[PDB]
Amino acid sequence: VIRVPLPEGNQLFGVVEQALGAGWMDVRCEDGKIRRCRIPGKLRRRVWIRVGDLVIVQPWPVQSDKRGDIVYRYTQTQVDWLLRKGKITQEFLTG
RNA sequence: UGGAGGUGAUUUAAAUGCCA
Ligand SMILES: [Mg+2]
């Protein structure tokens, strides 16, 4: 079929509202809480993360409130390709 | 040969740079 990072293991999905900066990414997840993410040492070179962008993140189990870690960003090729299959519906990005 | 002072002048606008 295809190779995409689905929710496999303990991943999350991350769509930020506004970046406070300095690494911390502020995401409006549908988990319920306001979450704040940080970046590992491999992806601060080739890519670009902005508000209006959907990515997959990975949390740590602490406090289930403010978690997340960037492990993969989504391209203009797959962001809306993950729509018809309904793995995410876009009613949680503007309303 | 090579130096130390002084007096004059010197012209539109013209910002910023992943990451091994
Ligand atoms: Mg001038």
XYZ file of N, CA, C and O (backbone and C1' of nucleotides) and ligand atoms in Angstrom:
521
model
N 0.835 -1.187 0.000
C 0.000 0.000 0.000
C 0.879 1.249 0.000
O 1.154 1.820 -1.053
N 1.344 1.649 1.184
C 2.049 2.914 1.366
C 2.768 2.872 2.713
O 2.452 2.048 3.575
N 3.770 3.747 2.882
C 4.502 3.890 4.145
C 4.283 5.284 4.731
O 4.892 6.259 4.285
N 3.436 5.369 5.751
C 3.171 6.629 6.441
C 3.293 6.383 7.942
O 3.020 5.267 8.411
N 3.734 7.366 8.725
C 3.664 7.227 10.185
C 2.261 7.455 10.725
O 1.912 8.575 11.104
N 1.452 6.402 10.769
C 0.107 6.438 11.337
C 0.208 6.679 12.840
O 1.307 6.937 13.348
N -0.898 6.648 13.598
C -0.738 6.444 15.042
C -0.317 5.008 15.321
O -1.161 4.105 15.320
N 0.974 4.779 15.558
C 1.486 3.449 15.860
C 2.292 3.514 17.145
O 3.306 4.215 17.215
N 1.858 2.764 18.150
C 2.535 2.774 19.425
C 1.848 3.691 20.406
O 0.820 3.330 20.985
N 2.407 4.881 20.607
C 1.798 5.858 21.499
C 1.887 7.259 20.915
O 2.128 8.223 21.646
N 1.707 7.383 19.605
C 1.837 8.672 18.954
C 0.650 9.574 19.277
O -0.339 9.164 19.886
N 0.792 10.836 18.883
C -0.277 11.820 18.868
C -0.245 12.555 17.538
O 0.701 12.427 16.757
N -1.279 13.358 17.301
C -1.354 14.224 16.134
C -1.301 15.670 16.606
O -1.955 16.028 17.589
N -0.522 16.493 15.915
C -0.283 17.840 16.382
C -0.565 18.917 15.358
O 0.032 18.938 14.276
N -1.486 19.815 15.699
C -1.805 21.005 14.916
C -1.764 22.191 15.870
O -2.607 22.302 16.766
N -0.796 23.061 15.693
C -0.553 24.106 16.681
C -1.517 25.262 16.448
O -2.099 25.419 15.369
N -1.716 26.053 17.500
C -2.445 27.314 17.425
C -1.533 28.506 17.207
O -1.856 29.387 16.406
N -0.403 28.542 17.906
C 0.566 29.623 17.849
C 1.811 29.170 18.595
O 1.713 28.566 19.666
N 2.977 29.456 18.023
C 4.256 29.051 18.608
C 4.713 30.157 19.545
O 4.960 31.286 19.116
N 4.811 29.832 20.833
C 5.410 30.770 21.769
C 6.898 30.946 21.482
O 7.474 31.999 21.783
N 7.539 29.929 20.911
C 8.914 30.059 20.476
C 9.896 29.236 21.280
O 9.502 28.526 22.207
N 11.179 29.323 20.918
C 12.279 28.715 21.662
C 12.182 27.194 21.715
O 12.718 26.567 22.634
N 11.515 26.585 20.733
C 11.318 25.152 20.669
C 9.922 24.708 21.045
O 9.361 23.827 20.379
N 9.339 25.315 22.070
C 8.024 24.926 22.561
C 6.965 25.171 21.495
O 6.804 26.302 21.026
N 6.232 24.122 21.125
C 5.163 24.217 20.133
C 3.830 24.024 20.844
O 3.656 23.040 21.569
N 2.902 24.964 20.648
C 1.618 24.923 21.341
C 0.517 24.356 20.443
O 0.023 25.044 19.544
N 0.081 23.129 20.734
C -0.826 22.392 19.859
C -2.234 22.332 20.452
O -2.429 22.216 21.665
N -3.228 22.419 19.567
C -4.639 22.219 19.897
C -4.977 20.806 19.447
O -5.476 20.592 18.340
N -4.700 19.843 20.316
C -5.010 18.456 20.025
C -6.482 18.191 20.314
O -7.173 19.001 20.935
N -6.968 17.065 19.822
C -8.285 16.701 20.311
C -8.215 15.733 21.496
O -9.198 15.042 21.802
N -7.069 15.672 22.179
C -6.962 14.894 23.404
C -7.663 15.571 24.572
O -8.111 14.894 25.503
N -7.774 16.893 24.543
C -8.532 17.591 25.562
C -7.761 18.717 26.213
O -8.347 19.686 26.707
N -6.442 18.594 26.214
C -5.586 19.529 26.916
C -4.842 20.427 25.938
O -4.830 20.176 24.729
N -4.250 21.495 26.474
C -3.254 22.297 25.768
C -1.899 21.614 25.929
O -1.439 21.395 27.052
N -1.249 21.293 24.816
C -0.005 20.541 24.848
C 1.143 21.347 24.248
O 0.946 22.183 23.362
N 2.355 21.076 24.743
C 3.558 21.837 24.400
C 4.679 20.858 24.056
O 5.054 20.018 24.878
N 5.221 20.985 22.847
C 6.147 20.005 22.285
C 7.557 20.571 22.138
O 7.761 21.788 22.124
N 8.528 19.661 21.999
C 9.930 19.995 21.770
C 10.495 19.103 20.665
O 9.894 18.097 20.287
N 11.664 19.471 20.145
C 12.204 18.857 18.928
C 13.474 18.050 19.195
O 14.398 18.535 19.872
N 13.569 16.807 18.678
C 14.828 16.050 18.760
C 15.920 16.549 17.821
O 15.691 17.455 17.019
N 17.103 15.932 17.895
C 18.315 16.510 17.329
C 18.592 16.216 15.870
O 19.729 16.334 15.410
N 17.556 15.841 15.125
C 17.744 15.400 13.749
C 16.953 16.246 12.755
O 17.332 16.336 11.582
N 15.867 16.878 13.197
C 14.925 17.522 12.293
C 14.959 19.043 12.355
O 14.097 19.684 11.751
N 15.929 19.633 13.050
C 16.058 21.085 13.080
C 16.898 21.578 11.907
O 17.486 22.661 11.981
N 16.984 20.788 10.831
C 17.802 21.148 9.673
C 17.009 21.231 8.366
O 17.046 22.260 7.688
N 16.275 20.182 8.000
C 15.771 20.046 6.638
C 14.349 20.562 6.436
O 13.926 20.702 5.284
N 13.605 20.851 7.505
C 12.161 21.032 7.392
C 11.696 22.382 7.937
O 12.510 23.268 8.215
N 10.375 22.561 8.047
C 9.801 23.869 8.370
C 8.409 23.651 8.951
O 7.536 23.107 8.267
N 8.204 24.077 10.194
C 6.948 23.875 10.909
C 6.296 25.219 11.236
O 6.907 26.090 11.864
N 5.049 25.390 10.803
C 4.320 26.662 10.969
C 2.875 26.364 11.376
O 2.417 25.219 11.313
N 2.145 27.397 11.795
C 0.747 27.235 12.189
C -0.129 27.174 10.945
O 0.081 27.892 9.960
N -1.138 26.306 10.998
C -1.809 25.827 9.808
C -1.268 24.521 9.267
O -1.780 24.029 8.255
N -0.241 23.947 9.907
C 0.374 22.688 9.479
C -0.021 21.565 10.429
O -0.055 21.744 11.648
N -0.366 20.417 9.854
C -0.613 19.210 10.628
C 0.634 18.342 10.612
O 1.265 18.166 9.566
N 0.998 17.797 11.769
C 2.108 16.870 11.878
C 1.689 15.733 12.795
O 0.612 15.746 13.393
N 2.558 14.742 12.904
C 2.442 13.730 13.942
C 3.490 14.043 14.990
O 4.614 14.436 14.662
N 3.119 13.905 16.252
C 4.014 14.127 17.366
C 4.039 12.856 18.204
O 3.292 11.909 17.951
N 4.916 12.830 19.205
C 4.989 11.711 20.116
C 5.077 12.308 21.516
O 5.911 13.192 21.752
N 4.229 11.890 22.443
C 4.364 12.372 23.823
C 5.180 11.454 24.731
O 5.627 10.379 24.320
N 5.382 11.902 25.973
C 5.835 11.083 27.087
C 4.663 10.988 28.058
O 3.838 11.912 28.113
N 4.529 9.906 28.820
C 3.280 9.687 29.566
C 2.979 10.669 30.694
O 1.968 10.502 31.381
N 3.805 11.688 30.904
C 3.699 12.523 32.099
C 2.516 13.475 31.951
O 2.457 14.273 31.013
N 1.552 13.351 32.867
C 0.553 14.370 33.187
C -0.525 14.513 32.121
O -1.546 15.168 32.358
N -0.338 13.874 30.966
C -1.340 13.843 29.893
C -1.930 15.218 29.586
O -3.022 15.313 29.028
N -1.234 16.297 29.938
C -1.749 17.648 29.763
C -0.930 18.422 28.736
O -1.484 18.896 27.742
N 0.383 18.538 28.934
C 1.257 19.328 28.065
C 2.411 18.447 27.596
O 3.472 18.429 28.223
N 2.221 17.731 26.488
C 3.220 16.774 26.012
C 3.397 16.933 24.505
O 2.878 17.868 23.892
N 4.159 16.016 23.908
C 4.431 16.050 22.482
C 5.902 16.135 22.108
O 6.686 16.798 22.794
N 6.283 15.466 21.016
C 7.643 15.534 20.473
C 7.557 15.301 18.974
O 7.013 14.283 18.536
N 8.086 16.245 18.193
C 8.075 16.130 16.740
C 8.914 14.944 16.289
O 10.091 14.820 16.644
N 8.312 14.068 15.489
C 9.016 12.910 14.948
C 8.843 12.847 13.437
O 9.597 12.153 12.746
N 7.854 13.570 12.918
C 7.580 13.578 11.487
C 6.629 14.724 11.169
O 5.626 14.922 11.856
N 6.962 15.478 10.126
C 6.084 16.518 9.616
C 5.336 15.982 8.393
O 5.779 15.035 7.734
N 4.200 16.596 8.069
C 3.373 16.138 6.962
C 3.508 17.092 5.785
O 3.603 18.311 5.963
N 3.517 16.523 4.583
C 3.722 17.252 3.341
C 2.372 17.685 2.760
O 1.311 17.208 3.167
N 2.429 18.597 1.783
C 1.248 18.945 1.003
C 0.726 17.774 0.182
O -0.310 17.915 -0.481
N 1.418 16.635 0.202
C 1.007 15.438 -0.519
C 0.134 14.516 0.325
O -0.721 13.817 -0.231
N 0.300 14.521 1.650
C -0.404 13.586 2.518
C -1.329 14.241 3.535
O -2.163 13.539 4.118
N -1.218 15.557 3.757
C -2.046 16.223 4.765
C -3.528 16.007 4.485
O -4.298 15.647 5.384
N -3.946 16.210 3.237
C -5.328 16.010 2.829
C -5.569 14.625 2.254
O -6.723 14.262 2.001
N -4.500 13.857 2.037
C -4.639 12.447 1.703
C -5.051 11.633 2.919
O -5.650 10.563 2.771
N -4.735 12.113 4.124
C -5.242 11.501 5.348
C -6.665 11.946 5.688
O -7.069 11.850 6.853
N -7.419 12.441 4.706
C -8.777 12.928 4.911
C -9.845 11.949 4.426
O -10.758 11.615 5.185
N -9.761 11.490 3.170
C -10.788 10.597 2.632
C -10.897 9.318 3.453
O -11.999 8.802 3.673
N -9.762 8.793 3.915
C -9.772 7.611 4.763
C -10.223 7.908 6.186
O -10.322 6.980 6.994
N -10.489 9.170 6.511
C -11.170 9.493 7.749
C -10.373 9.240 9.002
O -10.936 9.277 10.099
N -9.071 8.979 8.874
C -8.230 8.849 10.059
C -8.262 10.127 10.883
O -8.121 10.081 12.109
N -8.462 11.267 10.226
C -8.780 12.532 10.877
C -9.801 13.256 10.013
O -9.677 13.286 8.784
N -10.826 13.816 10.648
C -11.769 14.690 9.966
C -11.409 16.136 10.278
O -10.989 16.454 11.396
N -11.531 17.003 9.274
C -11.034 18.365 9.411
C -11.996 19.283 10.156
O -11.773 20.499 10.170
N -13.052 18.748 10.771
C -13.904 19.620 11.572
C -13.232 20.083 12.859
O -13.769 20.973 13.528
N -12.077 19.514 13.216
C -11.346 19.889 14.418
C -10.148 20.774 14.123
O -9.202 20.801 14.920
N -10.159 21.483 12.992
C -9.103 22.436 12.670
C -9.610 23.846 12.396
O -8.786 24.754 12.247
N -10.922 24.063 12.320
C -11.491 25.394 12.143
C -12.800 25.534 12.923
O -13.427 26.598 12.938
N -13.209 24.471 13.610
C -14.439 24.489 14.380
C -14.629 23.266 15.254
O -15.435 23.278 16.184
P 66.358 57.239 -2.656
O 66.413 56.092 -1.553
C 65.289 55.807 -0.736
C 65.706 55.104 0.530
C 64.681 55.091 1.652
O 63.732 54.046 1.529
C 66.769 55.802 2.498
P 62.179 54.388 1.292
O 61.472 53.959 2.652
C 62.169 53.200 3.623
C 62.116 53.856 4.980
C 60.807 54.529 5.353
O 59.800 53.626 5.768
C 62.616 55.934 5.939
P 58.339 54.188 6.114
O 58.461 54.629 7.633
C 57.583 55.592 8.184
C 58.279 56.418 9.231
C 57.425 57.455 9.919
O 56.609 56.903 10.931
C 59.488 58.416 9.311
P 55.079 57.359 11.046
O 55.146 58.638 11.984
C 55.935 58.635 13.160
C 56.161 60.029 13.685
C 54.958 60.940 13.685
O 54.047 60.696 14.739
C 56.790 62.101 12.799
P 52.502 61.110 14.552
O 52.446 62.606 15.091
C 51.571 63.549 14.509
C 52.155 64.937 14.483
C 51.187 66.013 14.035
O 50.350 66.461 15.070
C 53.181 66.245 12.833
P 48.769 66.393 14.873
O 48.465 67.650 13.937
C 48.800 68.953 14.386
C 48.882 69.979 13.284
C 47.626 70.256 12.490
O 46.662 71.020 13.196
C 49.488 70.186 11.040
P 45.122 70.966 12.739
O 45.142 71.569 11.278
C 45.361 72.948 11.058
C 45.248 73.255 9.597
C 43.926 72.888 8.966
O 42.931 73.847 9.231
C 45.687 72.161 7.580
P 41.391 73.420 9.222
O 40.923 73.789 7.746
C 40.164 72.880 6.972
C 40.620 72.852 5.537
C 39.867 71.884 4.645
O 38.636 72.402 4.192
C 42.165 71.553 4.345
P 37.310 72.185 5.067
O 36.211 71.886 3.973
C 35.954 70.556 3.579
C 36.709 70.183 2.334
C 36.297 68.854 1.743
O 35.183 68.999 0.890
C 38.640 68.922 1.944
P 33.837 68.223 1.237
O 33.881 66.982 0.258
C 33.149 65.818 0.565
C 33.944 64.574 0.285
C 33.499 63.333 1.027
O 32.364 62.725 0.432
C 35.858 63.504 1.083
P 30.879 63.215 0.798
O 30.430 64.079 -0.459
C 29.088 64.541 -0.606
C 28.401 63.870 -1.764
C 28.190 62.373 -1.578
O 27.024 61.951 -2.273
C 29.661 62.737 -3.393
P 26.163 60.740 -1.680
O 24.842 61.443 -1.155
C 24.151 62.383 -1.956
C 22.699 62.014 -2.093
C 22.287 60.732 -1.407
O 22.073 60.900 -0.019
C 21.380 60.806 -3.590
P 21.951 59.613 0.930
O 20.438 59.178 0.735
C 19.944 57.974 1.286
C 19.148 57.202 0.273
C 19.288 55.693 0.361
O 18.423 55.122 1.329
C 19.572 56.392 -1.884
P 18.998 54.536 2.708
O 19.861 53.277 2.251
C 19.228 52.067 1.855
C 20.182 51.120 1.169
C 21.410 50.683 1.958
O 21.145 49.673 2.922
C 22.061 51.302 -0.223
P 22.345 48.933 3.707
O 21.615 48.128 4.872
C 21.006 48.787 5.976
C 19.808 48.019 6.474
C 19.999 46.515 6.641
O 20.608 46.143 7.864
C 18.067 46.895 5.372
P 21.764 45.025 7.870
O 20.980 43.656 7.674
C 20.054 43.197 8.642
C 19.280 41.999 8.151
C 20.074 40.719 7.966
O 20.248 40.025 9.188
C 18.687 41.088 6.085
P 21.319 38.836 9.339
O 20.571 37.567 8.756
C 21.204 36.295 8.778
C 20.646 35.365 7.734
C 21.529 34.161 7.420
O 20.707 33.032 7.126
C 21.174 35.412 5.453
P 20.298 32.001 8.287
O 20.343 30.575 7.586
C 20.478 29.390 8.365
C 19.465 28.341 7.977
C 19.645 26.984 8.661
O 18.404 26.413 9.071
C 19.759 26.733 6.287
P 18.388 25.416 10.339
O 19.283 24.171 9.882
C 20.319 23.650 10.713
C 21.373 22.929 9.902
C 22.783 22.911 10.489
O 22.976 21.842 11.408
C 22.863 23.606 8.214
P 24.432 21.506 12.014
O 24.991 20.347 11.075
C 24.243 19.164 10.836
C 24.873 18.344 9.738
C 26.183 17.661 10.102
O 25.986 16.410 10.732
C 26.446 18.824 8.058
Mg 24.807 58.678 1.153
